[PDB]
Amino acid sequence: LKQTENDLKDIEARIKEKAGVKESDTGLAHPLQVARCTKIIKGEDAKYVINLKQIAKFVVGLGERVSPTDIEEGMRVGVDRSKYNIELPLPPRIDPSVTMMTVEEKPDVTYSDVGGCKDQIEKLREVVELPLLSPERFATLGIDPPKGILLYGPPGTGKTLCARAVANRTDATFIRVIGSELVQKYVGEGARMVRELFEMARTKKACIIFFDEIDAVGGARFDDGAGGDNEVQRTMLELITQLDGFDPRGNIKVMFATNRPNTLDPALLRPGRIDRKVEFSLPDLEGRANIFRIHSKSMSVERGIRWELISRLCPNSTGAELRSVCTEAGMFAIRARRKVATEKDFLKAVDKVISGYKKFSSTSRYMQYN
Amino acid sequence: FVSNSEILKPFEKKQEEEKKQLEEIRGNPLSIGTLEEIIDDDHAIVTSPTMPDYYVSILSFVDKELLEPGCSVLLHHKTMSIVGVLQDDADPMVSVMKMDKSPTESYSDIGGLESQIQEIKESVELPLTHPELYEEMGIKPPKGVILYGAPGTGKTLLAKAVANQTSATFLRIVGSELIQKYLGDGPRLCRQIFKVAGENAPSIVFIDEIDAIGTKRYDSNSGGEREIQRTMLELLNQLDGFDDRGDVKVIMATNKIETLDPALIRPGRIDRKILFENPDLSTKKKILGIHTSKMNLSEDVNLETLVTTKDDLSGADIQAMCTEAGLLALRERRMQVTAEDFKQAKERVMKNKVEENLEGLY
Amino acid sequence: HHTDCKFIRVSGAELVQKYIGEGSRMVRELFVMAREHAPSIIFMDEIDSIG
Amino acid sequence: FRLARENAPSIIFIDEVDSIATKRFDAQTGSDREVQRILIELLTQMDGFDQSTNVKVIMATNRADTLDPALLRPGRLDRKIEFPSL
Known part of the structure; x- marks a missing residue:
């Protein structure tokens, strides 16, 4: 019965909370959709009363002086509709309106494919981590860190796994927005509503947002669409507007995801909204030898096993495809009931998984340029 | 007190x-x-x-x-x-979602398929009630399973029996209605299903016969219809982009998932392959013999007579041959079925759904 | 009539819905109506043949 | 439709009913519901019909293929008059 006795001190403090309400007691009783108050009784020009709603739409040309002495009446005055700025009396302005935002904390992902990502992750570190360490080298040399970056390749073979792993070491705000749900219906639901997230990115610093599912946003057109994809294409152009006139690159990052690099609008892929591109392909053999180690760090393996002959059975592959070999190898200890992971389990798994199980249904010829 | x-x-x-x-x-x-x-x-x-x-x-x-x-x-x-x-409480305003019920299911009618029955049990039923072996080994078990072939022949009926063997919450989501002529309804309702149900660990979502989604061809995003390719893009976020702790499980049973498969499955989130197999002499006896456990018929007729020479009759084909021959004998109000209704029910089933490609020799 | 039950008619073309799909929920909504009255027969209309 | 019950020699003609054809939802109550509450009342005010049988309701339309098929049920709309050229 904690909540039972918690209200004992809270109801007594509710009057203390009401003491702040005692400033304005009129009209009965900071994120806002549109700025709305009741009559704004408090308030050249002295008092300032503006409201936008179905009744009594107000507008004032002047401002920037103290009528209200900070908050007044309905407490909501500030940025809405754009066009409207009350700044001088401690504004609750540029605040997220009613919308759908996905905000999580600590997207913890460990290392997946280090085989070809040795110097490839360093390019990702030069995006976010670089301005957070030695910003003085940017003003002296005259160079700026990359903002936009593109991810292309097979669907999450250790490419996407690396994208979520580096973001965990950034220690900043992580927000995931996709492109599939972005369509919706109303014009502006996929652009103006997301523009509020882009406008807040300049307000709240230390924010990192990964743009997802760009195939549902961009893409090349010939007949200029069959209809219904115009807003899909206008959202592509709305992303350009935030990068068009002005934008800081310090606290704002741009990263895409797709299966092929050039499937977007060839004008969209033009540089300046993408400074660098992530080239993701099948790395060499000895480079992926650390992948077999990472999965075996927490895995009990018989001492004396030789990984040299195991890697020979496996041709060029990715990080996730190597875990599938150990995944079925873990199933070899289920049915056949092996104590630990042996060499015969790994040598057979490559022929069991890649040769035996995998067979068809893989991405091979589906990426050239386009 | x-x-x-x-x-x-x-x-x-x-x-x-x-x-x-x-x-x-x-x-x-x-x-x-x-x-x-x-x-x-x-x-x-x-x-x-x-x-x-x-x-x-x-x-x-x-x-x-x-x-x-x-x-x-x-x-x-x-x-x-x-x-x-x-x-x-009760039913949320989101798309169609089942809540709970306890079905009566086991392995009986699908008997003889145990070669592929014990395979799906290892990656589904076992990593549920005994959350172990991943601390000592350290390999993450697969998420869902993927089955391609003829449903209802005992391959999909296998999934119906596993649902009861879990002794936990089972979910069934419809994968048809996403193909609506409206653009953008697919990725919306699918995300709210797994997000609200993330509190309850057991899910095991089953979907049947999706022939639409999966158009890719040479590029990732083509100029084709947007009612299809973008709806699939939401499934990439569930199986790859945003991954749970192993609560949500997606199962899709369709006819041919070949072209459909490597836009979704990914290397190692979901590893399963189960295809419809022609039963041998031993499997056909366990399928037909167990169906007759509660059935009564003439003691002068052997159940293995038509098992020797027959063309591709699965548990689905037998389900009608038992019902068709049963309704003919029930007209006379008798619990036993004569021999003439046995061959009469096999012809009309073989002459309708069962058709080969007329490919001989080879 | 002779079966001692009811008759439920369901519009096929009206079941198809754009925007947020109503027909997806209309499946379980009619299932509740099917649960309330056990002696009934649900019929699929507008996909049938009047000619 | 109340005057149709009072004065018997009355003819009510509604031109261009094709303004609504199949259906729409979108905003729900906003800029939609207006004709959906009519359909319920088209099943209501026409229920009091057949008492006098003096009521005359004739609806004009262009494309009849996309209209409501449920209206063709007897008691609301019985027989449609085709207007070809020929």
């Missing part, structure tokens, strides 16, 4: 007085609004079809966990400040 004398004495004195303080902040409209966002200064946002305008500040009785962005709450009578919170 014992404490009703001693401990209750310095209790009810403050229990009734706080209720009067509630009547001061409640009244009896109890207006039900919607809380859009939580403010560290204890202030809320009112929502109502009358378009309310309020600066109301968050009162007591609610906490940061109870207050939710967009779920209904209780309001003050005059000032309309937040008081309580609405309790969610």
